[PDB]
Amino acid sequence: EDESEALRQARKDAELTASADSVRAYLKQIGKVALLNAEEEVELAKRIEAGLYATQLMT
Amino acid sequence: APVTHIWYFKGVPSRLGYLLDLAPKDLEKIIYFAAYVITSVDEEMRHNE
Numbered sequence: 402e403d404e405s406e407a408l409r410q411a412r413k414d415a416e417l418t419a420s421a422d423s424v425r426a427y428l429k430q431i432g433k434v435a436l437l438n439a440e441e442e443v444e445l446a447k448r449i450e451a452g453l454y455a456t457q458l459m460t
Numbered sequence: 461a462p463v464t465h466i467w468y469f470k471g472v473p474s475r476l477g478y479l480l481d482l483a484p485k486d487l488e489k490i491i492y493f494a495a496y497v498i499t500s501v502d503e504e505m506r507h508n509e
Contacts, residue, residue, distance in 0.1 A: 419485070419494060426494065 464491050 402408070420426040437445075468475040469491065474484040482490075489495035 419489065421488075421492075423492075426492075 416429075420429055464476070469477075469484075469487060474487065476482070477484045477487050480487075486495070490497045
């Protein structure tokens with residue numbers, strides 16, 4: 402079903418796998434983080450700008 | 461970055477596995493970036509903390 406820990410146990414068991422194919426291992430690796438939206442991109446870019454200004458003023 | 465010789469990891473008998481007392485599957489997971497391994501651990505700090 403969609404509950405009772407059967408699906409969760411199957412998912413975690415399949416996630417703790419080998420995947421000897423290097424390309425497939427890389428794909429399963431990238432398939433972790435979710436996608437973003439324009440506001441999140443703008444906020445992240447502002448954070449990077451603040452960080453670079455911070456480090457240049459350190460210098 | 462370092463690399464491991466294929467002869468002493470993949471073969472009839474796994475020489476790296478025999479030397480380190482590690483299963484070949486776990487060794488492949490270690491040297492192919494599929495599983496982390498604990499290089500060393502402290503005893504005094506763990507004991508007193």
